[PDB]
Design a protein around this ligand. Structure first.
Ligand SMILES: [Mg+2]
Ligand SMILES: [Mg+2]
Ligand SMILES: [Mg+2]
Ligand SMILES: [Mg+2]
Ligand SMILES: [Mg+2]
Ligand SMILES: [Mg+2]
Ligand SMILES: [Mg+2]
Ligand SMILES: [Mg+2]
Ligand SMILES: [Mg+2]
Lengths: 129, 218, 88
RNA sequence: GUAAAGCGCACGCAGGCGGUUUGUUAAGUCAGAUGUGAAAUCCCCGGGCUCAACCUGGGAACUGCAUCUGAUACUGGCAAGCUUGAGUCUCGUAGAGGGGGGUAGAAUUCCAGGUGUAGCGGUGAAAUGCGUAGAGAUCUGGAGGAAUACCGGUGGCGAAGGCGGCCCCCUGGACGAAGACUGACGCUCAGGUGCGAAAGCGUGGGGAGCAAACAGGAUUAGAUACCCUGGUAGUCCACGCCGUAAACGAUGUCGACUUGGAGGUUGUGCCCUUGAGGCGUGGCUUCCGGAGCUAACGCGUUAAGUCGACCGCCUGGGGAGUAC
């Protein structure tokens, strides 16, 4: 049963980009969106929109550069039954910096690079390179 | 959508999920190539051919399928263009260094009949070489005068002449072909979603390309 | 399973009102019916294990509905048990 | 999956994990500060013994614990919900699902009698055996036990083990759909509890066919076998026990994603349904195969692909699943 909605979102994209799917829909939710924003402001995804009135469906338009998709690597990190929390001086660096690591800080869901500068730490979420 | 409106789709329902992006509909158990991208793709590719054709680019037409074979040989002979309508020998491209020697025979042998240097020798002996030339003309014949790999390759159907494309895309030789549903476009770098069958369909573009070729070289 | 009549009948005595059959109390009560009525069928035969499998599923389930009810509202829970005389 | 390794299968306590919205809290989490974390080791920068080892100044570190002040995204607690998870109801559908009790036809064997006469039976041949006390064959009547040809299938149902004639009684689950209702009541599960093929065990029945043991005949060098002639337990039933199997998909359960093809079974919607029908669309199920995965064979939307939750298990062969 669904015990980790975040993982499903990430998986939906990785498997989607693999099949060259135009986009990818799923049951939206606050956190899901907040995370998508970071993905957008980072050029990993084209755009995204959450339809529905009483049943929010988050439409995530995948993105592809040349003869390949943008998101080549994206895996959950701070999964349930084993949560992970790091310090500002202990934030992970995805792909030596070329990649990002979605982190949920007390200020919101931001990229590692950003949070690391905002002088605050938080719970990692995944690594999108 | 001129004469083009005389070919529509092809292949019943076997198709290939890869050609889906180029399909329109499917009536009576048969997909119909979406011209909405068919004709648009037409020029886009055809332009590239003439582009390199201008430098007398070595063009190699491929089409072994009987129903369309004869046509290909004719069109490709409308200029320095080349062709292959008899069982795409394995290696006549990737193994030119070796396959070429075969062409030499076709030559040195032709001269025999071509000139008085043939009447000599018994029937059996002469006969032995006469039969040999026949076969050679089938395969090498339309490539005997191509000392070197082609600047580009153009095959009628992908699946059928699959072997050809494979050797081509390996040598970096731009592959131009017409694929339809059942065909696999992951090979041809210049897709041409069209009916790989129908005598009318083949000649249609066969001459089209040929023309752009002769006119290509200034 | 249970007669359509005995069903609607019990759906009223415990149902939040009527036409509704999702009420926790209802389910619990409904289950107890078959649970008790089946005791007779099982008192005899016995070796009818496959049928028992279904029986237990009802018990174990009712156990959850009841347990759940207690968490969402102790009131209804305590009262419910009284009418059905359960929990030892 | 086949190398060591998925418990034979379920139900389920503890425990682990938890769809979605708002508010609230601030416990985990994060930020800052204050204590404390002996000195010496270590490391950095720099000194002193001719250098070095060695010695030494300052800092970094001591990744920890406590308290104080905040931050509130995420996890947690509380409140109010919500409906897509799960469940209930209604009405339908298919089925060798289970327990009990009847019952039918075919056949085998046995008993009795008629007809009938010298073989039958068996094998590669034989022989044991059965026959003139009349077999076998054939016909008639009777007794009894076990299993249900055809339908039958790539089929169906079940947690697994497993479940086939027909009828009744009692009873479990699954699926579809117009919907109606509940409102996260869920997933997994050590220990625990229950179900467990065949063989085997106890008590009391039953006993036709088949058949461990056993006894003959044969084959063979021998033949404590394979084959033939017989035949006890058992196989059948009731109740209690045993709990194992190559208990096998050799593949734990739950949920979400990822090209396609051909077919089966069952529910349901639309279509002159005027039709066999055609088109959709759920459940379960065969074979083929793409990406991908794999040591390879292969698996491949019913994954061994891509992921998340919980559990079980493996750590070279023999000794040994043996000893205690
Ligand atoms: Mg083995
Ligand atoms: Mg093994
Ligand atoms: Mg198993
Ligand atoms: Mg110290
Ligand atoms: Mg909260
Ligand atoms: Mg037994
Ligand atoms: Mg016994
Ligand atoms: Mg099944
Ligand atoms: Mg396969």
């Amino acid at each position: 049963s669904m015990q980790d909605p975040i993982a499903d979102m990430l998986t939906r994209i990785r498997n989607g980009q693999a099949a060259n799917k135009a986009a990818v829909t799923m049951p939206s939710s606050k956190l899901k969106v907040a995370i998508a924003n970071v993905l957008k402001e980072e050029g990993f995804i084209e755009d995204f929109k959450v339809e529905g009135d009483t049943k929010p469906e988050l439409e995530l338009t995948l993105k592809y550069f040349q003869g390949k998709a943008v998101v080549e690597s994206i895996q959950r990190v701070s999964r349930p039954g084993l949560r992970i929390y790091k310090r500002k001086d202990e934030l992970p660096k995805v792909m030596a910096g070329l990649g990002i690591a979605v982190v949920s800080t007390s200020k919101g869901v931001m990229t590692d690079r950003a949070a690391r500068q905002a002088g605050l730490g938080g719970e990692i979420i995944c690594y999108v390179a | 959508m001129l004469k083009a409106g005389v070919h529509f789709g092809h292949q019943t329902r076997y198709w290939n999920p890869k050609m889906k992006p180029f399909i329109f509909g499917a009536r009576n158990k048969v997909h119909i190539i979406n011209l909405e991208k068919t004709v648009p793709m037409f020029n886009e590719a055809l332009a590239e051919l003439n582009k390199i054709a201008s430098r007398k680019g070595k063009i190699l037409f491929v089409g072994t399928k009987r129903a369309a074979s004869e046509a290909v040989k004719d069109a490709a002979l409308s200029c320095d263009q080349f062709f292959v309508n008899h069982r795409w020998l394995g290696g006549m491209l990737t193994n030119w260094k070796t396959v070429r020697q075969s062409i030499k025979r076709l030559k040195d042998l032709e001269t025999q009949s071509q000139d008085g240097t043939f009447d000599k020798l018994t029937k059996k002996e002469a006969l032995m070489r006469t039969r040999e030339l026949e076969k050679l003309e089938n395969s090498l014949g339309g490539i005997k005068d191509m000392g070197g790999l082609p600047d580009a390759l153009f095959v009628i159907d992908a699946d059928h002449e699959h072997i050809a494309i494979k050797e081509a895309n390996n040598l970096g030789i731009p592959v131009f072909a017409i694929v339809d549903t059942n065909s696999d476009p992951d090979g041809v770098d210049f897709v041409i979603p069209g009916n790989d069958d129908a005598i009318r369909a083949v000649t249609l573009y066969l001459g089209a390309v040929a023309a752009t070729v002769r006119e290509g070289r200034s | 399973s249970l007669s359509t009549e005995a069903t609607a009948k019990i759906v009223s005595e415990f149902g939040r009102d009527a036409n509704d059959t999702g009420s926790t109390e209802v389910q619990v009560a409904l289950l107890t019916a078959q649970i008790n009525h089946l005791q007779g069928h099982f008192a005899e035969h016995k070796k009818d294990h496959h049928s028992r499998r279904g029986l237990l599923r009802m018990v174990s389930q009712r156990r959850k509905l009841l347990d759940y009810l207690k968490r969402k509202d102790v009131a209804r829970y305590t009262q419910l048990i009284e009418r059905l005389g359960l929990r030892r």
